Structures are given as C-alpha cells and as structure tokens.
Amino acid sequence: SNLVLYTLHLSPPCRAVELTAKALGLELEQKTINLLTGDHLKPEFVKLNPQHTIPVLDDNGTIITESHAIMIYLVTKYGKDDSLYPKDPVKQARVNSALHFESGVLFARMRFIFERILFFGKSDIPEDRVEYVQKSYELLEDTLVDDFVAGPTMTIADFSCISTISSIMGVVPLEQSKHPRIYAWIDRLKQLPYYEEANGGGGTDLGKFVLAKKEENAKA
Amino acid sequence: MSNLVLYTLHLSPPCRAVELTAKALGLELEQKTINLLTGDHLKPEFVKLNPQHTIPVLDDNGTIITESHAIMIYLVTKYGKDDSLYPKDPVKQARVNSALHFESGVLFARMRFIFERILFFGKSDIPEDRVEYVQKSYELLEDTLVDDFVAGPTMTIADFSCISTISSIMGVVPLEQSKHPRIYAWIDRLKQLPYYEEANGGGGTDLGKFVLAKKEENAK
Ligand SMILES: N[C@@H](CCC(=O)N[C@@H](CS)C(=O)NCC(=O)O)C(=O)O
Ligand SMILES: N[C@@H](CCC(=O)N[C@@H](CS)C(=O)NCC(=O)O)C(=O)O
Numbered sequence: 001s002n003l004v005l006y007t008l009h010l011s012p013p014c015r016a017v018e019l020t021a022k023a024l025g026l027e028l029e030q031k032t033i034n035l036l037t038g039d040h041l042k043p044e045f046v047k048l049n050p051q052h053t054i055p056v057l058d059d060n061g062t063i064i065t066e067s068h069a070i071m072i073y074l075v076t077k078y079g080k081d082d083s084l085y086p087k088d089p090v091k092q093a094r095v096n097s098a099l100h101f102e103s104g105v106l107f108a109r110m111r112f113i114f115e116r117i118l119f120f121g122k123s124d125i126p127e128d129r130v131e132y133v134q135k136s137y138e139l140l141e142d143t144l145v146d147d148f149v150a151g152p153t154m155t156i157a158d159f160s161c162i163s164t165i166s167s168i169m170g171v172v173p174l175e176q177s178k179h180p181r182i183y184a185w186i187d188r189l190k191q192l193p194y195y196e197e198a199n200g201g202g203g204t205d206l207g208k209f210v211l212a213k214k215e216e217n218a219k220a
Numbered sequence: 221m222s223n224l225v226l227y228t229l230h231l232s233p234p235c236r237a238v239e240l241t242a243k244a245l246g247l248e249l250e251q252k253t254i255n256l257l258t259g260d261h262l263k264p265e266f267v268k269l270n271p272q273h274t275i276p277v278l279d280d281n282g283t284i285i286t287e288s289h290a291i292m293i294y295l296v297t298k299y300g301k302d303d304s305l306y307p308k309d310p311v312k313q314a315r316v317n318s319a320l321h322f323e324s325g326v327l328f329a330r331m332r333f334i335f336e337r338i339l340f341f342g343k344s345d346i347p348e349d350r351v352e353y354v355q356k357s358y359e360l361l362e363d364t365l366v367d368d369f370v371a372g373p374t375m376t377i378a379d380f381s382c383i384s385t386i387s388s389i390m391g392v393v394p395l396e397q398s399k400h401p402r403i404y405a406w407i408d409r410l411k412q413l414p415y416y417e418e419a420n421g422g423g424g425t426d427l428g429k430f431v432l433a434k435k436e437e438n439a440k
Contacts, residue, residue: 050363051322062311066318073314090283093294097287101272103321116349128337142271147365 002029003074004058006048009202010209011035012107012163013067014055018072019159022194024078036118068099071156084156091151094163098150098157101143106164109136113172114210123218125172133172137179144181146190154188162189163199170207224295225250225279227266231427232256233328233384234288235276236420240380241292243415245299257339289320292377305377316371318379322364327382330357331389335431344438346392355395358400361386366400368409375409383410385418391428 003021005028007014021028031052033039042051049056049065057064057073064073075085086092113129116122140161143149152156165174165182176183189195224242226236226249242249254260254275259365261273270286277288278285278294285291296306334350337343359383364370371378386395386403397404410416 040408050366051360064311064314064318066321068321069314072317073310076313089294089297090285090414092297093290096290096293097285099288099326100287100321103325104329107324108333112333132333132430139272145271214274 001060002027003197004029005030005035005070006045006056006058007029007054008033008035010206011054012110012119012167012206013053013160014163015166015199015202016067016156016160016163016197017057017070017074018198019163019192019194020074020084020156022129022192022198024074024082025161026074068103068156068160071159075156077184082152085114086155095155095157098143098155099141101149102157102160102164105136105139105167106161109133110164110168113168114206117213117217118209121217123214127213133168137174137182141179141181144185148185158185158189159199162186163203164202166199167206170204171210221423222281223248223250225252227252227254227269227277227279228275229254229256230423231430232275233331233388233424233427234274234381236243236423237288237377237380237384238278238291238295239274239419240384240413240415241305241377244300244305244375244380246353247295266282289324289377289381292380296377304374307376308361312372316376316378319364319371319376320381322360323378323381323385326357326360327385328391330354331385334389334392337439338431338435342438344435344440346435351393354389358386358395358403362400362402363433365406369406379406379410380420383407384424385403387420387424388427391425392431 005014005017007017007030009015015210018028033045035054035100039045042055046052048058048063051065053057053065055067055070057070072085075082079085085095109129109132113125113133117125140149146152148154148158149161174182190200224240226235228238228251230236230239239249254266256275260266261275267273269284271391272286274286276288276291278291284296293306296303300306307316330353334346334354361370367373369375369379370382386407395403411421
C-alpha cells in the first residue's frame with residue numbers, strides 16, 4: 001500500500017518531507033490536516049500523534065511522527081544509496097547537527113513569529129522575534145562553509161532548512177547583500193526539477209498568508 | 221588514542237545531556253571550560269572551531285562535532301557496547317529521532333526563549349506568553365510519556381536531552397505535580413541512576429536559581 005502523509009502544503013516540515021519523497025522517487029498519498037480549522041486537534045489525529053503536529057507518515061500501518069524522523073526513515077528504508085543521509089558516523093554527525101539546527105533554531109524561531117499571527121490573532125512581529133530570526137539567518141550563513149548545509153553534497157538537512165527559509169524570508173527580510181551564501185544555496189536548490197512543486201510555491205504562499213493574516217488581525 | 225574532549229559548561233543543559241550520555245556509556249570526558257557568562261564562546265579560536273559559537277563541542281582525536289544530539293548519537297554509535305541508548309531498528313530509531321527533535325525544537329527552544337533575554341540581554345521579566353509556551357511544552361512531554369521513557373520502554377539519549385532541559389526550566393516556570401504525573405514518575409526513574417545528580421540534577425537546579433538571581437539583578 002502507498003505511503004500516506006498527513007499534511008498541509010503551507011507547513012514547512014511537510015514540504016521538507018515532500019522534497020525528500022521527490023528525491024527518493026516515492027509517491028505519497030496526501031491527506032489534508034487543516035490546522036486553521038483544528039483538524040490536528042480531533043481525537044482521530046491525536047491518536048496518531050500525541051503532540052498533534054504535522055507531518056505524520058503512515059507506512060502500511062506503521063506510524064512515524066516528526067519531519068526529520070520521517071525523512072531519515074524514508075531514506076533508510078527506500079534510498080537506493082545513502083547520499084541524502086549518510087551511514088558514515090562522521091558525515092552523519094554533520095547532517096544530524098544541521099537537522100537540529102533546523103528544528104532548534106530556524107523552525108522554532110519561525111514558529112515563534114508565525115503561530116501567534118496565524119492562530120492567536122496577533123497583528124505584530126515584535127522586535128525580539130525579528131532579532132531572533134535575523135540571528136538565525138546569520139547562523140545559517142556562517143554554517144554554509146560548503147555548498148550545502150552539511151557539506152559538499154545535498155542532504156535531507158538542506159530540505160529541512162529550505163522549507164523554513166523559503167517561508168520566513170517573505171516576512172522577515174533576508175537581505176541579499178548580507179547573506180550571499182544563503183542566496184547562492186537557494187539558487188542551487190531551485191535547480192532541482194521538483195523544487196517548485198514540492199517546496200517553492202508553498203513557502204512563498206505561507207509568507208504571503210502570514211502577511212495577509214497580520215493585516216486582517218490589525219483590522220479586526 | 222586521545223581521551224574525548226568536550227568544550228563545555230556544567231551549567232548548560234545540552235552539555236549536561238552529553239555528560240549523562242558519557243556516564244551511561246562508561247566514557248571519560250576531558251572537559252575544557254567555555255564560560256558563556258564571560259563570553260568565552262565568542263573568542264576567535266572558539267568561533268573558528270564552531271561558527272555557531274555554541275556549546276557543547278566534541279573533539280574526538282581531531283574530529284570536531286557540534287551539537288549535543290549529534291554528539292550523543294556519535295558517541296553511542298562509535299563507543300556504545302550496545303545500541304540500547306540509540307537503536308538501529310528503523311522504527312524504534314524513528315521514535316527516538318522524533319523525541320530528539322521535540323527536545324530541540326520545543327523543550328530547549330522554549331527554555332532558551334525564556335532564559336536568554338534574562339541571562340544576556342538584561343531583562344528582568346518573564347512575559348506571560350513565554351510562561352504559556354513553556355507550560356505547553358510540559359503538557360506535550362507528558363502526553364508523549366505513554367511508556368516508562370520518552371521514546372519507549374528503554375531509556376535512550378532522548379531521555380537525557382529532555383531531562384537536561386526540564387531540570388533547568390522547572391525552577392523558573394514551575395512544572396506542577398498534579399498536572400504532570402507521568403513526568404514526575406519519569407524523573408524518579410532517572411534519579412535512580414547513580415550518576416544522575418552529578419551529571420545533571422544539580423546543574424539544572426543551579427541554572428534555574430541563576431536565572432532568578434539574574435532577573436532580580438537586572439531589575440530597574
Ligand atoms: N519538529 C516538528 C514540528 C512540527 C510542527 O510544529 N508543525 C506545525 C505546523 S508547521 C503544527 O503541526 N502545529 C500544530 C500544533 O503544534 O498544534 C516537525 O518537523 O515535524
Ligand atoms: N542544539 C544545540 C543548542 C546549543 C546551544 O544553544 N547552547 C547554548 C548554551 S545552553 C549556547 O552555547 N549559547 C551561546 C550562543 O548561542 O551564542 C545543542 O544541543 O548543542
């Protein structure tokens with residue numbers, strides 16, 4: 001049976017998994033979990049993930065939660081080689097470090113900005129949020145000593161990072177002159193034949209939605 | 221070959237996560253102090269070593285690994301007599317990986333959102349939204365603890381990551397017993413480890429106390 005992803009295209013971690021599936025040549029059956037209408041808080045979803053977050057993978061009855069765990073699981077089970085997630089302990093350590101940089105820094109700080117606008121009716125992006133996000137950009141820039149986030153080769157860590165960066169750059173400005181490594185890295189990822197469908201459109205659209213929601217919230 | 225070297229500060233939660241892991245693996249760590257409180261992490265030589273200027277950093281005979289979760293996985297992978305602390309079964313490992321990213325993306329990130337502004341930016345308050353964010357993280361952890369440990373019936377590195385953070389934040393944003401019976405029973409299990417207090421418990425308590433003292437010093 002097909003792999004099932006419980007998902008929403010606007011969600012960055014969902015798009016990270018979509019990029020990974022495209023890279024692996026996997027077809028995902030996508031089941032919408034609409035966060036705006038509280039689909040993730042329904043008992044039938046909470047049973048799949050006590051943390052009530054998307055994405056969640058159902059692989060023939062086996063439930064895997066959390067985008068990074070899902071990506072590692074998919075590469076491990078379905079990869080024809082380990083290029084996207086190395087088995088070598090030292091190469092893997094660099095990828096693992098970057099995956100946690102994404103969850104702990106990039107995504108967390110994006111969510112600290114977006115959640116309150118999308119779900120709590122806020123009409124601002126406080127100075128401290130802006131500062132945190134700008135610092136996350138600096139940290140990513142300084143991490144990009146090689147062409148990709150975890151070395152000379154593209155890995156799942158790049159998919160995680162771009163899913164988030166492509167979303168927040170539309171809201172908290174990512175100054176081109178100050179982040180040449182990030183922009184050059186974005187250009188590399190944009191060369192992927194599946195980049196637009198798996199990530200680019202949804203990242204751009206999430207940023208636009210946050211800006212629209214901020215305006216709506218300011219008015220009422 | 222050389223003893224493992226950790227650039228570290230006992231007060232730091234991710235450093236204590238690594239300390240717990242080394243104790244569990246029966247490994248000696250040569251600790252080199254990087255005092256964040258005096259800006260040691262920003263000296264040119266350390267930044268060259270870790271462009272993100274965070275601790276912990278492992279030096280294993282010239283191999284440099286940043287990021288506590290990556291360090292823990294590397295240590296178990298290379299030096300574990302068995303893989304109990306970080307399983308190789310894809311599904312069991314996915315459960316651990318999911319919990320590790322919950323720790324970095326939720327528990328740790330929200331603790332840092334509370335602590336950093338006090339410890340380093342001269343702030344003297346804990347905004348209500350920070351308290352709520354942290355309380356939510358406790359609820360998410362409680363709901364994740366369906367088994368004896370965070371990622372299943374066996375203690376793993378995910379437990380060490382989680383407790384290092386929980387033991388720190390609970391002294392500032394109270395983690396109330398009636399609401400979190402699973403967390404308290406889990407803490408009791410970890411407290412049965414002979415090395416728990418030394419590797420983690422006291423340091424977590426001390427960080428919470430230091431945050432409260434700094435908050436008061438920062439006032440007016
Ligand atoms: N570390 C998780 C983060 C998942 C996450 O926070 N997803 C958001 C959507 S972007 C969500 O489901 N939020 C709903 C909630 O937290 O209740 C992952 O990468 O899968
Ligand atoms: N995900 C990282 C977090 C590391 C981290 O943020 N450590 C803090 C101390 S708790 C630090 O070094 N802060 C200094 C800085 O970010 O400049 C890990 O687990 O190693």
